[PDB]
Amino acid sequence: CPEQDKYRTITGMCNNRRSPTLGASNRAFVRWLPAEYEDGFSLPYGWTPGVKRNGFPVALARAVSNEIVRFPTDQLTPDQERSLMFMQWGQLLDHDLDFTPEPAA
Amino acid sequence: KVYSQNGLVLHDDANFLEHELSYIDVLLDKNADQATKDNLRSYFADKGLHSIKDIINKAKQDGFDVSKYE
Amino acid sequence: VNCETSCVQQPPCFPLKIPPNDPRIKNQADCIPFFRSCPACPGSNITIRNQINALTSFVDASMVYGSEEPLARNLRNMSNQLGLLAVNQRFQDNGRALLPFDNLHDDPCLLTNRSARIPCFLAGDTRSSEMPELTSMHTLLLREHNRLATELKSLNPRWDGERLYQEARKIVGAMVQIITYRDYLPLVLGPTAMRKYLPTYRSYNDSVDPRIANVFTNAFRYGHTLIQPFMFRLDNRYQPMEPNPRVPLSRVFFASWRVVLEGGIDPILRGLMATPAKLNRQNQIAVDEIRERLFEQVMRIGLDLPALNMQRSRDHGLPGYNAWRRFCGLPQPETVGQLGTVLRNLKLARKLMEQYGTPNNIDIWMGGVSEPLKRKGRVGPLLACIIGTQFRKLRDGDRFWWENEGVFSMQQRQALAQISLPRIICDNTGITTVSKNNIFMSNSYPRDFVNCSTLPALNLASWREA
Numbered sequence: 001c002p003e004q005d006k007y008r009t010i011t012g013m014c015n016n017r018r019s020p021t022l023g024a025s026n027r028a029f030v031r032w033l034p035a036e037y038e039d040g041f042s043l044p045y046g047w048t049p050g051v052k053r054n055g056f057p058v059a060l061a062r063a064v065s066n067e068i069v070r071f072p073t074d075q076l077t078p079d080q081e082r083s084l085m086f087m088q089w090g091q092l093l094d095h096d097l098d099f100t101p102e103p104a105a
Numbered sequence: 106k107v108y109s110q111n112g113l114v115l116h117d118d119a120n121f122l123e124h125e126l127s128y129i130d131v132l133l134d135k136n137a138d139q140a141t142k143d144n145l146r147s148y149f150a151d152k153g154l155h156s157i158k159d160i161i162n163k164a165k166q167d168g169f170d171v172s173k174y175e
Numbered sequence: 176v177n178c179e180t181s182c183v184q185q186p187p188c189f190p191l192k193i194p195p196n197d198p199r200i201k202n203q204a205d206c207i208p209f210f211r212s213c214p215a216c217p218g219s220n221i222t223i224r225n226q227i228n229a230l231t232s233f234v235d236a237s238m239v240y241g242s243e244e245p246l247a248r249n250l251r252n253m254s255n256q257l258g259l260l261a262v263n264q265r266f267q268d269n270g271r272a273l274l275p276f277d278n279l280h281d282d283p284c285l286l287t288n289r290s291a292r293i294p295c296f297l298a299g300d301t302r303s304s305e306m307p308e309l310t311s312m313h314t315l316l317l318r319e320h321n322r323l324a325t326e327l328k329s330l331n332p333r334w335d336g337e338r339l340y341q342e343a344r345k346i347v348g349a350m351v352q353i354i355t356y357r358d359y360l361p362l363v364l365g366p367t368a369m370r371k372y373l374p375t376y377r378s379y380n381d382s383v384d385p386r387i388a389n390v391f392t393n394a395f396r397y398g399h400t401l402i403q404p405f406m407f408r409l410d411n412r413y414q415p416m417e418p419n420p421r422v423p424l425s426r427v428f429f430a431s432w433r434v435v436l437e438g439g440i441d442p443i444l445r446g447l448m449a450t451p452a453k454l455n456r457q458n459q460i461a462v463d464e465i466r467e468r469l470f471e472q473v474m475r476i477g478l479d480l481p482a483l484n485m486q487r488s489r490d491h492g493l494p495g496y497n498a499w500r501r502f503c504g505l506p507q508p509e510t511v512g513q514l515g516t517v518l519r520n521l522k523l524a525r526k527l528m529e530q531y532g533t534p535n536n537i538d539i540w541m542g543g544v545s546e547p548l549k550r551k552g553r554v555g556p557l558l559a560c561i562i563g564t565q566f567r568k569l570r571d572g573d574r575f576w577w578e579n580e581g582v583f584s585m586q587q588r589q590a591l592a593q594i595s596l597p598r599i600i601c602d603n604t605g606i607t608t609v610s611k612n613n614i615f616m617s618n619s620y621p622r623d624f625v626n627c628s629t630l631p632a633l634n635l636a637s638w639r640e641a
């Protein structure tokens with residue numbers, strides 16, 4: 001890494017001089033807890049029919065959404081103390097921090 | 106080098122961009138200075154496009170109209 | 176990879192199955208499409224599967240400039256030494272710059288209006304066209320970089336294009352850090368959590384790891400609970416814009432034609448400023464415009480964003496709710512009654528226990544958004560901990576943090592402390608009346624608004640090199 005620098009690299013490389021890829025693009029995420037997979041290392045919970053997670057059947061994501069998340073739109077509670085700009089700055093900020101690639105068709 | 110999410114290709118680095126057609130006009134302008142054209146030819150050669158024919162041909166392959174450059 | 180049309184579960188597809196008696200999808204043989212995130216080490220029986228971050232974790236405005244050298248150069252105007260970002264060459268917004276168009280082989284923006292033929296935009300991040308409100312903010316920062324580079328050229332005439340580009344990129348990045356940490360994050364976390372997870376900055380610490388944790392990518396999707404079901408556009412008097420002032424969100428996703436052909440970014444920014452955000456409540460979590468009709472115009476079926484969030488946490492092998500509560504030093508409920516006390520809502524706890532069986536298996540997004548909101552905050556204790564911890568690491572572990580010694584002079588730091596998002600709106604739009612105090616709290620016109628003459632412009636005098 002150059003021992004003198006005035007500007008950030010575009011890729012984020014060299015920000016940390018001791019470990020130059022920390023924060024740089026196209027690198028694995030850091031994990032705060034070890035991953036929990038159906039087979040221990042790659043298959044997601046809900047992959048194999050009948051296989052339980054920690055003693056319980058895996059709830060279909062759409063079923064959870066239909067039972068807990070669903071509500072009548074015309075009853076929406078407006079936030080008195082937040083502008084819709086508060087929502088939008090968050091997504092613009094999220095797009096500065098992370099993009100998880102997935103394979104193209 | 107294909108940015109995909111939810112099955113939608115959101116970006117492809119290989120494709121020619123529309124605003125790069127304005128750079129072809131500068132390279133063909135007899136009043137543009139040499140240093141200006143030198144930076145644009147360096148920019149295009151780094152994408153594998155060495156000659157002006159290559160630049161117009163890449164714009165054509167990727168859907169842009171290049172009739173004005175005939 | 177036929178995950179877009181096939182409901183067969185083969186890698187890399189992991190389709191969401193349809194439950195019985197679903198309110199919208201009556202065909203139980205159909206599914207909601209889903210592609211598993213790319214693994215960092217493909218075909219491996221040694222490493223525990225992890226996912227990739229295609230961006231820089233730093234708050235460095237990479238959604239404007241890019242996170243890879245080839246895209247970053249493509250975003251620059253290479254026809255001169257002014258250090259500007261490239262702009263749209265066919266369309267302008269009342270004489271102002273628009274983002275350049277991108278060239279995609281299958282463009283989803285063209286599917287929103289087949290007669291308009293307005294493709295997706297090109298920006299530092301590839302999702303800039305996801306909703307016209309996001310496009311309006313990307314366009315705003317594109318104009319801000321060009322305005323700054325123009326002002327620096329007038330001050331330092333001997334500076335070349337690379338120097339002007341880098342000096343404006345440095346200011347735009349610092350502005351994003353200032354709006355985020357000063358105005359935004361205290362309104363997400365509340366005062367208690369803001370003091371707890373983000374104490375007063377001291378200096379750069381090279382031992383602080385600045386990477387995004389895999390859990391943050393799902394936890395930060397709490398913002399989906401703030402989404403309103405319409406796009407609001409207001410005129411120069413902050414009154415509903417002539418035809419279609421409240422457009423259903425299922426008709427704005429990827430609708431870049433609306434920016435170009437329906438009035439530009441001013442009506443969209445005024446709607447963002449003078450419309451309230453949706454309030455997340457325990458029995459009003461997320462609107463049907465994203466739970467039933469997400470991207471339905473550009474796809475075979477409308478997706479369900481909250482369900483995509485839960486399926487994504489399982490794709491990423493994230494631990495459940497109690498493991499994340501334990502990580503945070505928060506109590507972990509075992510029974511329905513204990514979950515009811517933590518949520519201060521026994522009816523929601525009963526529903527969650529009927530779906531998950533145990534608070535150990537509750538998906539991180541579902542459990543996190545279920546928690547009651549902290550005082551003057553819009554997240555509960557669990558999400559305050561994850562978000563708060565992440566943003567402290569992005570600030571303390573960033574060698575180019577705007578307050579770090581050597582990044583800016585003391586005089587440039589004093590000048591940067593005067594910036595605000597309403598003033599950036601003043602500088603780069605036809606808007607002359609903008610929001611008061613904190614733009615993220617102000618939400619009612621005219622009560623919370625001021626004229627642009629009241630706000631000072633950023634003073635670049637300390638950037639002079641004689």
Ligand SMILES: *[C@@H]1O[C@H](CO[C@@H]2O[C@@H](C)[C@@H](O)[C@@H](O)[C@@H]2O)[C@@H](O[C@@H]2O[C@H](CO)[C@@H](O[C@@H]3O[C@H](CO[C@H]4O[C@H](CO)[C@@H](O)[C@H](O)[C@@H]4O)[C@@H](O)[C@H](O[C@H]4O[C@H](CO)[C@@H](O)[C@H](O)[C@@H]4O)[C@@H]3O)[C@H](O)[C@H]2NC(C)=O)[C@H](O)[C@H]1NC(C)=O
Binds near residue numbers: 380382383568
């Ligand atoms: C520069 O930042 C460094 C990182 O700081 C962390 O992140 C920032 C953003 C803040 O959130 C901050 O609060 C974080 O700590 C920072 O270095 C860190 O300093 C702490 C405190 O000295 C270190 O903790 C000690 O760790 C050892 C080793 O065990 C740890 O790792 C294992 C394995 O992962 C875990 O299982 C353990 O739970 C620990 O996490 C412990 O043995 C030690 O125990 C202490 O026990 C009692 C209190 O219970 C004390 O009386 C003793 O004296 C012991 O110290 C600590 O828990 C931490 O490891 C270290 N991290 C790194 C990355 O080096 C540094 O101090 C900052 N410097 C400045 C100038 O700000």
Ligand code: HEC
Binds near residue numbers: 309
């Ligand atoms: C403006 C309307 C809006 C739409 C449409 C939207 N979001 Fe998200 N969203 C995220 C984060 C973080 C992710 C994960 C991003 C990543 O790492 O790829 C995400 C992921 C998604 C994904 C990927 C879904 C999947 O798992 O397959 C879609 C689609 C999405 N959001 C749509 C933070 C937000 C925030 C932050 C407060 C807001 C506001 C927000 N999102 C508003 C929106």
Ligand SMILES: *[C@@H]1O[C@H](CO)[C@@H](O[C@@H]2O[C@H](CO)[C@@H](O)[C@H](O)[C@H]2NC(C)=O)[C@H](O)[C@H]1NC(C)=O
Binds near residue numbers: 124255260261262264
């Ligand atoms: C590079 O910068 C120049 C100068 O800002 C741009 O040229 C202007 O383009 C607009 C339309 O886009 C015209 O109305 C102006 O008259 C032009 N001015 C000059 C001095 O040429 C140029 O378009 C930019 N290139 C890109 C790709 O954005």
Ligand SMILES: *[C@@H]1O[C@H](CO)[C@@H](O[C@@H]2O[C@H](CO)[C@@H](O)[C@H](O)[C@H]2NC(C)=O)[C@H](O)[C@H]1NC(C)=O
Binds near residue numbers: 290
């Ligand atoms: C698709 O986009 C076109 C514009 O390209 C829209 O057509 C315009 O609609 C307005 C309505 O106020 C008319 O005043 C214009 O005359 C129309 N323009 C043209 C060229 O026809 C059209 O409305 C859009 N379609 C949808 C579904 O909104």
Ligand SMILES: [Ca+2]
Binds near residue numbers: 096097232234235237
């Ligand atoms: Ca970034």
Ligand SMILES: [Cl-]
Binds near residue numbers: 030031032033388389
């Ligand atoms: Cl994690």
